[PDB]
Amino acid sequence: GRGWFDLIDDWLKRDRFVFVGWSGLLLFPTSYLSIGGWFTGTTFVTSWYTHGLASSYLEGCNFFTAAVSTPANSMGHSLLLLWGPEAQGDFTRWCQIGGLWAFCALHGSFALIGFCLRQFEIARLVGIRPYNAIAFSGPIAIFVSVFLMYPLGQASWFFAPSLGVAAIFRFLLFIQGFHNFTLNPFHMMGVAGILGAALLCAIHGATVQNTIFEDGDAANTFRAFTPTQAEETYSMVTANRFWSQIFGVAFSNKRWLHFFMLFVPLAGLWTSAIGIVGLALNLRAYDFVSQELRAAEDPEFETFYTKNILLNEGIRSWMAAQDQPHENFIFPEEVLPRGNAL
Amino acid sequence: GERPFSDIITSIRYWIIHSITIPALYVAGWLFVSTGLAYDIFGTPRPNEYFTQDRQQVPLVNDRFSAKQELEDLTKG
């Protein structure tokens, strides 16, 4: 009867509890290996030979301090395949050089590809527009830029974020100290997008929950709604009046409201990705030249920006010795910047 | 179609095979840690193996294509 491809397409697109689809073949093994490798790294694999750190439960770390640490700086931008010239098939040496981070990173890249393809496939089979995959392009941009394009522009994989909690905090403070990323305007747009998306989520939830129609006699109003009803469950006119006379402007179009909720975080993530891509090559908004000139010509001239520059110097100088152990930075106590030193 | 939860939890085989398999996995993990097999498999140092007598510093790997030999030199003894 049917061809083999048609039978495989019928089985993959079966309406079961966990949809597989054609995207599932790429998604499920890659995501499974990413999560499994992260648990394996945070559970057993050390960071003693790459960072001189303990980042596993086997070494005594908790959930915050355990991480899948990035490879060593000497590895460069190697793919760090298990069969590659660095490990040469030795699983122990592959774990010791940080190859598990590359395992997780590559499998997570292809797992994000698989999940976006899953969104496309389910939207096509269900019959709706694929705006969820466009929304998920945001986190894909974040992961690509930060975990791939930033280290690929830097010396090695060593300066990529390590898959942990305190490791991510280290990445935050390291990027602030060596890059002044708070001063970067694309990061400012990203912060604006994230905080405005949280604002939109909270305000839309509150407005809908506070402009509902009295569709039941019970004081708890959650049961007064059926998914198959035709009428709206909350008053758009009352909400529009409330926000027109409270804030000055208000949404009148529900569709535009929800596209704005879609757009704000997506734009924030994409602009912050542009900022991180700029940081990848040390093309930074680190300094304002005129402020530095005026501070050099006038010792009494001081702004909060100059204080931030001094704090970045402190971060770099007090962090580089133990944060980049491969460089063998030996900084004496007199070259270390101190507030009392001047 | 799908298998309901009541049929899953009321199955007699479902309980006996779990009772004979899952504690075996738990003890297998316990012995994978407690016998020192995890340290040897994953290369994680023992608490007495972070520093050696000759190496009192951080064992950094400084070459890419001789990393296996350098790790064997650093982790010997």
Partner: peptide, 30 residues
């Protein structure tokens, strides 16, 4: 025997193995 069985057992056997490993690691004298 279905795909859901395999999807559960992928996230179950190593989960129990890791939970046992972590419970064993809780008793290592630091």
């Amino acid at each position: 025997f279905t795909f859901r069985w395999l999807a559960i057992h992928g996230l179950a056997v190593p989960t129990v193995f890791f939970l046992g490993a972590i419970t064993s690691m809780q008793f290592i004298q630091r």
